[PDB]
Design a protein around this ligand. Structure first.
Ligand SMILES: CC(=O)N[C@@H]1[C@@H](O)[C@H](O[C@@H]2O[C@H](CO[C@]3(C(=O)O)C[C@H](O)[C@@H](NC(C)=O)[C@H]([C@H](O)[C@H](O)CO)O3)[C@H](O)[C@H](O)[C@H]2O)[C@@H](CO)O[C@H]1O
Lengths: 258, 257, 257, 256, 259
């Protein structure tokens, strides 16, 4: 039960940070990239390596202790993808688009996703191929059945660990997440162009239809993201996912609850 | 029905929340959510699709708490479930070029949902009136060449799962007064899927008189199609790929005469 | 006419609901909704399309209850009927690559509709003024080279079905005071059809003075074109494919002097 | 000094007309097309022929003789003949074996303006060493700076079939007494997207509630509607343009 | 800075109007507005771009009427426009024919369109596609790069305080700073991406923040920044060059008292 907002100078606070992408980081020079993608011979034999799998990013940000029951209420978000212009590097071991041409820029399938919540993002598992063998060191839908290719309600989890939950197996659970606001776009196809807007003049309001934002349990704010921008194609044609960091600025206020 | 006032009080509202699985054809025990690979007849006359190559409309009839009062559907939140699964470009796909990743799901899509107080009303329209639709499907009967544009004989209710093929039926715009429907067809073999997800978006189901669908016999009807595109295998064979759809509907008690 | 007050009361409103079938050329008894395969002239000057290769504007004139009072058209709901039929990619199509599904309908599209209290007024514009338009169609006569850009002699009324070729005529923006019209041409050979359906969208037909089309002689005129794109067969021959359009119009009685 | 609007029966008027495109008109049969486009052998030798260069269209429309001035308040406009681009049977290049002709497509520029005096132009050159042909009005004394901004290149759109589209844009440092709108969509496979309706009005009033004030009782209308390129059987490409409809409502306004 | 009332009166508003020229690299005396042709390194380690192959941010510091009570000029509105959009219709100047007998391939592919108005220099954060890229002499670039610089390294902070210097590909606006600037940009990537460029003199952007305050011009200087890489020009032989265009700015300012 939600009561009144506290006012006064001490009543507001602000969280500011960035979440780095977790694309797989196949070697010490390739932070922000995945391993080159290879294709299994069959559905049965799909067995991606961990460094080939982009994962959800998450940060748990402690807020000023509030231990009347008060909670921090997240009200507004400003967010931005950081380093969008890095994708103009078309002179770095890329594949020429045509004889004597510049390198093929990063493109193809993208997923841009962010959420703000008063607890961990709740996830539902959905598998493209239920017979995929997910690698050690990732957290993936377990006891998969063919029904996992459409909906298996056993696959419930919390986004509670960084570089662990592969993007391709998990989505926000729309049956839960009442105390989180999430937003995402998947743009598919191998040739889709990245379209990335930046400005410091856009704010998202996080209040629901009753004027209540995410309420931070135990004084923690949960920020989550995925920004798979597309694939980089190298000179020999191997393709790697490329990700970028996401900025978050969230304003919170103190709210009394019963 | 003459529509009178809304009931208030804590008992006066209820909520339905569920998901509808897609019915893309399910050609074997490992391929739920996919169709059979798509083949092409040599002529219009010989068009004879397998049942498991034809995606169908999904429908769920949701019983509501027993109630002259009727449940009125006011708001919908909906969402395609599992959008990220289409990032699996490593599973038996066709490389886009030498050493490349697999071609992702792409091509013709149909995304559709409806909320109604009775079954969705369908009108039959055939691409090719001589198509032979297979046993187990419910399809436009006594088809003529006029069925390729409009034959008013082809009326039906979406009253059964895995039955009504997507390609030969649409919502009947001459009926459906007690239903709200929304759909988009995006055609072309290279169309990129564009799938948005959020829990912050609500659709209001009220018509221009402030009246939502009224649930006859205390049943709410949900229907959906989410054909996302085609998956292309190593050999170039293509299968429709679908995803489940979440519905959350809020309803209120309304008195009627 | 001075336009005076709207009449109220039970008798004072009416509704029209119908569908217009597309007129794409209909080359044989099995191919309603399709044009003949398109062939290309050997030279610019020898362009001579056959009648069954030329999509035409559709038009219906709808009698209203007999009534100075005039029926005033206030709102429109409209929808393309049978959007899902374009998922038939298994019927005499051209494979998009080896073992692939059929190339779906795509390419140049024109979706157009109008509602008026008299016939839609047309202005003729020709791609090529030396085109020989075929007998049985109504086309810009006495064409000159100016007809490729603007020849004000080419005026007509859309007063006949299966007659006015889409490629020759557009709504005349210098006239049509008593009609509301809306169209989109999307050109290019691979453009993807994007077709939205819903029963929740209404267009208001009133002008800036709050006045809708006034139906002369108690007739309402509906017009449409819905060339969705081209179908490509196995051998690569291409034909226009069209679909029917639904109209629901609400009208009220208006007094006039 | 703008004062009040005059009301009453006599105080409004309306202009209605069509501007034809000026695409180059390479022969007596080819009104609305350019000459087939050829490509120079090098950058320094770029020398387009006149009939290969689309130009800005302009009409100066006399208004009822009137201190009062006609003030332009609203505009309805659209491209005339959009359906003509469905002719894919007229000696085009087949998209594939047995296919229909390739439709008009590729780079487009759609532009219109309404002003109480001639549109003011600023010159910018893709390649300052382009020799523009006799019979066109082009930026003079071009330098390498003309490729980005050379403020010497100022002109008025005061003549039809004369100012090449590729050389000139509206001058954003001027045109206080004009409203202009344009979109360039570039790329050889760009599909035309053309909307028509008689239900859309553009308001021409500025933030102070004042529209273009017509000097000398003349209204200036300008347009470009390069819809794309038509590809002939043999691969040669010509710009194709279409006419634009204008309807402008004007009201009498007192001025000091 | 405690922001107080706006001054009114005839002498209390002013206007700045100008154009920023693009800085694409200018590889020779005939190629203002173009980059050098793009070449591709065989490894990430060996990426060493020449200066004239690297587009850079444009910046102008515009002196305002002197105000030295403390008054500061406050930027309130912006009109802006890319100048010369129609130049991209030159498909006849030694381009690569799209097909036999066809016109020249128009400028297309990756674009970045960006503008900012601030009361002090735009603040930048460095991000690198490839941390081992060696940026050339005469450019100002992220120093002491590490592999973390490919995603976020907070050491890479700078001010856009010099023209023809800050390469577009390694710097973005720093979202943790820029309180006294309003910035807007769009990256559209992909080699076949069609330029879509709108021009009009009827559009205005309001520069006021959620509290009604616009950029306050420190030292009576207005900072304008821009990038307008429109795509690439492909010549006959297939070599590709970036092509940019100038940007118009008209900014209205008012006098604002501060404590
Ligand atoms: C009947 C036919 O299309 N024949 C082809 C020849 O045209 C072609 O030889 C080229 O012809 C050129 C001039 O002819 C055209 C053209 O550019 O192709 C013919 C077009 O139909 C015509 N288009 C229109 C709308 O009128 C076009 C136009 O008038 C001008 O381009 C205006 O600039 O002219 C020219 O002489 C070339 O040098 C010549 O190669 C041959 C070989 O490609 O194939 C024939 O089948």
């Amino acid at each position: 039960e939600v009561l009144e907002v506290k006012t006064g100078v001490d009543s507001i606070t602000e969280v500011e940070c960035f979440l780095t992408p977790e694309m797989g980081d196949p070697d010490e020079h390739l932070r922000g990239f995945s391993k080159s993608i290879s294709i299994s011979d069959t559905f049965e034999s799909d067995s991606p390596n961990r460094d080939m799998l982009p994962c959800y990013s998450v940060a748990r940000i402690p807020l000023p202790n509030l231990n009347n029951i008060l909670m921090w209420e997240a009200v507004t978000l400003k967010t931005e993808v950081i380093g969008v212009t890095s994708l103009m590097n078309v002179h770095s071991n890329g594949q020429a688009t045509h004889d004597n041409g510049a390198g093929k820029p990063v493109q193809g399938t993208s997923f841009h996703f962010f959420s703000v919540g008063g607890e961990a993002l709740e996830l539902q598992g959905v598998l493209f191929n239920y017979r995929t063998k997910y690698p050690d060191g990732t957290i993936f839908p377990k006891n998969a059945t063919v029904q996992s290719q459409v909906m298996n309600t056993e696959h419930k989890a919390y986004l509670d660990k960084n570089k662990a939950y592969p993007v391709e197996c998990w989505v926000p659970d729309p049956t839960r997440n009442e105390n989180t606001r999430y937003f995402g776009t998947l743009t598919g196809g191998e040739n889709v162009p990245p379209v990335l807007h930046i400005t410091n003049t856009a704010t998202t309001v996080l209040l629901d239809e009753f004027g209540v934002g995410p309420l931070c349990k135990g004084d923690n704010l949960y920020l989550s993201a995925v920004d798979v921008c597309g694939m980089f194609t190298n000179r020999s044609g191997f393709q790697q996912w490329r990700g970028l960091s996401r900025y978050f600025k969230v304003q919170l206020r103190k709210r009394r609850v019963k």
